[PDB]
Amino acid sequence: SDELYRQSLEIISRYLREQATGAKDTKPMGRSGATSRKALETLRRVGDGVQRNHETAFQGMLRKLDIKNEDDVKSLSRVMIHVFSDGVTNWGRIVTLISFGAFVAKHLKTINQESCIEPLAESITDVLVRTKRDWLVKQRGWDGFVEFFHV
Numbered sequence: 756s757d758e759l760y761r762q763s764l765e766i767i768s769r770y771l772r773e774q775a776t777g778a779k780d781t782k783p784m785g786r787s788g789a790t791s792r793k794a795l796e797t798l799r800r801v802g803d804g805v806q807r808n809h810e811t812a813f814q815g816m817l818r819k820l821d822i823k824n825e826d827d828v829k830s831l832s833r834v835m836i837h838v839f840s841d842g843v844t845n846w847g848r849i850v851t852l853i854s855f856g857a858f859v860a861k862h863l864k865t866i867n868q869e870s871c872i873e874p875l876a877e878s879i880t881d882v883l884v885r886t887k888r889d890w891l892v893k894q895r896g897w898d899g900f901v902e903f904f905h906v
């Protein structure tokens with residue numbers, strides 16, 4: 756089975772949902788749980804900071820996307836490919852991809868479209884893993900993510 760994909764989706768899904776609801780999911784993690792738990796803590800620390808440091812730009816892009824429904828949510832894939840995939844890859848940019856995804860998740864809750872949060876997480880994971888697998892594998896995947904941001 757595609758383990759990198761499965762793990763990425765669990766991490767991204769949990770962060771997005773936690774960010775939108777303000778509550779942690781206490782379900783145990785799936786495979787590679789230890790690493791996934793550390794990746795989630797890393798994301799809470801660096802992801803939350805990113806949304807604040809670039810809050811104005813984040814509010815500007817959200818406005819531009821003018822999300823009101825599911826079709827609008829489905830159009831986000833093309834934008835992520837255009838902006839994230841078409842550029843030099845580094846951990847900072849992957850954190851921005853996921854951090855803005857969480858910013859959108861919060862927005863989805865505000866307009867009562869929470870059911871779109873998991874599909875959004877799946878869209879983000881598709882872009883990340885399916886367009887940057889070689890890079891991720893070379894940087895040791897999520898174990899590398901955790902080491903890179905280690906305090």
Ligand SMILES: O=C(O)c1ccc2c(c1)N(CC1CCC1)C[C@@]1(CCc3cc(Cl)ccc31)CO2
Pocket residue numbers: 812813816831834835838839847848849851852853855856859875879
């Ligand atoms: O400049 C960078 O290094 C950078 C790196 C990655 C990025 C972006 C910028 N994005 C644009 C910025 C401007 C304020 C957010 C967000 C985006 C594009 C739409 C989108 C929709 C969703 Cl659901 C998630 C992530 C993204 C693609 O991920």
